[PDB]
Amino acid sequence: DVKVQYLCENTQTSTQEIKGKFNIVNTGNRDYSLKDIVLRYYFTKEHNSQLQFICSYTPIGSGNLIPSFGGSGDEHYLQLEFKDVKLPAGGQTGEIQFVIRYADNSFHDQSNDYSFDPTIKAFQDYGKVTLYKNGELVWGTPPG
Numbered sequence: 001d002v003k004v005q006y007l008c009e010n011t012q013t014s015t016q017e018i019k020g021k022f023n024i025v026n027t028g029n030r031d032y033s034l035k036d037i038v039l040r041y042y043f044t045k046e047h048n049s050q051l052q053f054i055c056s057y058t059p060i061g062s063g064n065l066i067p068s069f070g071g072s073g074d075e076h077y078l079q080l081e082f083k084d085v086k087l088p089a090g091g092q093t094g095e096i097q098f099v100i101r102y103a104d105n106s107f108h109d110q111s112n113d114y115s116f117d118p119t120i121k122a123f124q125d126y127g128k129v130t131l132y133k134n135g136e137l138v139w140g141t142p143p144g
Contacts, residue, residue: 001028002087003139004039006126009097011118014109018043018100018116022080023123024131025092034064034082034093038132041098042143043113045076047106053078054099060085065096075114075143095123114143 003025010019022039026032045051051069055062066081078100087093102108110116115128131139 001030001138002026002032002037002131002133003125004129004131005123006115006117006120006129007123008116008118008120010110011121013111014107016101016105016107018098018108018110018113020098021123022096022098022129023092023094024087024096026087026089029089031089032087032133034060034085034087036133037082037087039080040130040132040142041078041100042071042115042128043076043078043100043108043110045071045073046109046112047102047104049102049104049106051076051078052101052103054101056097056099058096059094060096 005023006020008020010017053067055065064083064085068079070079071077127140129140130142
């Protein structure tokens with residue numbers, strides 16, 4: 001009913017910046033609001049510094065994103081929630097650029113990150129980024 005496409009922008013194994021794009025696609029016949037949708041990107045947090053999120057660009061308006069971080073060090077995640085943005089039946093958000101850095105600009109090893117796949121250089125359906133609608137997993141598979 002709803003799915004995620006992904007593309008990897010920073011393919012560097014060890015990096016100060018995780019960087020890619022999401023695209024949320026409504027593949028059914030019912031209109032949704034993004035406010036009911038929760039997206040997660042999974043990575044390993046090896047340093048204690050706090051994490052920062054940046055959206056460089058999205059057609060939906062970056063003001064409409066509600067980012068947060070959660071989970072253990074070994075399975076951390078970026079979580080995206082949203083304000084009341086319409087996702088019509090059959091429609092898509094278009095690109096949601098995401099950047100994750102440490103506040104202290106420390107380096108991060110992406111080769112340990114569950115959701116990292118630098119073979120994906122153009123958008124494609126991607127099961128290692130999850131979607132939840134109202135508590136229920138509707139797209140993808142979380143770590144384990």
